[PDB]
């Protein structure tokens, strides 16, 4: 009611919009034919992808995200992992999500979003998981 923006349950809930994705997908593409896509747009579109309601995006989103991970400085990886997990989680990739939400928490303990997620994925597993065997 009147402006939402809960915290995390809203971030995950809300997904990217074609209108936007297109806006980014355009920069990414253009930038490409421009001479070379800049990490900037890279993380953008990527984050835009993962955000997308489609899984495919998450797939073609993580890669980039995982591409900027090592191609990141420091705090840059903080904004990355955070997503890698978001996108990973979407693929019920808790194992990874956490692995990312964990290492991200190590550097970002105060980060609530990370905290929540940790629990979110935690519940996810219980809700529905692959299980071993």
Curated annotation (Swiss-Prot):
Q: Give the Cytoplasmic compartment stretches of this protein.
A: 8-127
Membrane topology of the entry: Single-pass membrane protein
Q: Where in the cell is it found?
A: Mitochondrion outer membrane; Peroxisome membrane
Magnesium among the record's keywords?
no
Q: Does the keyword Mitochondrion apply?
A: yes
Post-translational modification Phosphoserine, affected residues: 17
What domain of life? Eukaryota
Q: Locate the N-acetylmethionine modifications and list their residues.
A: 8
Keyword annotations:
Acetylation, Apoptosis, Membrane, Mitochondrion, Mitochondrion outer membrane, Peroxisome, Phosphoprotein, TPR repeat, Transmembrane, Transmembrane helix, Ubl conjugation
User: Which GO CC terms are listed, alphabetically?
Assistant: mitochondrial outer membrane; mitochondrion; peroxisomal membrane; peroxisome; protein-containing complex
* One GO term (biological process): negative regulation of fatty acid transport
The residue spans of each TPR repeat are 78-111
Q: Name one GO molecular function term.
A: identical protein binding
What does the entry report about post-translational modification of this chain?
Ubiquitinated by MARCHF5.
Role noted for this protein: Involved in the fragmentation of the mitochondrial network and its perinuclear clustering. Plays a minor role in the recruitment and association of the fission mediator dynamin-related protein 1 (DNM1L) to the mitochondrial surface and mitochondrial fission. May not be essential for the assembly of functional fission complexes and the subsequent membrane scission event. Also mediates peroxisomal fission. May act when the products of fission are directed toward mitochondrial homeostasis, mitophagy, or apoptosis.
Subunit comment for this entry?
Answer: Interacts with DNM1L/DLP1 through the TPR region; may form part of a larger protein complex at the endoplasmic reticulum-mitochondrial interface during mitochondrial fission. Interacts with MARCHF5. Interacts with MIEF1. Interacts with PEX11A, PEX11B and PEX11G.
Q: Which family does it belong to?
A: Belongs to the FIS1 family.
Q: What remark about domains does the record contain? A: The C-terminus is required for mitochondrial or peroxisomal localization, while the N-terminus is necessary for mitochondrial or peroxisomal fission, localization and regulation of the interaction with DNM1L.
Name this protein carries in UniProt = Mitochondrial fission 1 protein
**What taxonomic classification does the UniProt entry list for its organism?**
Eukaryota, Metazoa, Chordata, Craniata, Vertebrata
């Amino acid at each position: 009611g009147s402006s939402g923006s809960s915290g995390m349950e809203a971030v995950l809930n809300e997904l990217v919009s074609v209108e936007d994705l297109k806006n980014f997908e355009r920069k990414f593409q253009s930038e490409q034919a421009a001479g070379s896509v800049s990490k900037s747009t890279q993380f953008e579109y990527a984050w835009c992808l993962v955000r997308s309601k489609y899984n495919e995006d998450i797939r073609r989103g993580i890669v980039l995200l995982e591409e900027l991970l090592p191609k990141g400085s420091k705090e840059e990886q903080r904004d990355y992992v955070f997503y890698l997990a978001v996108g990973n989680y979407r693929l019920k990739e808790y194992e990874k999500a956490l692995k990312y939400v964990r290492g991200l928490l190590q550097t970002e303990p105060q980060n609530n979003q990370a905290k929540e997620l940790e629990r979110l994925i935690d519940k996810a597993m219980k809700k529905s998981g692959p299980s071993s065997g």
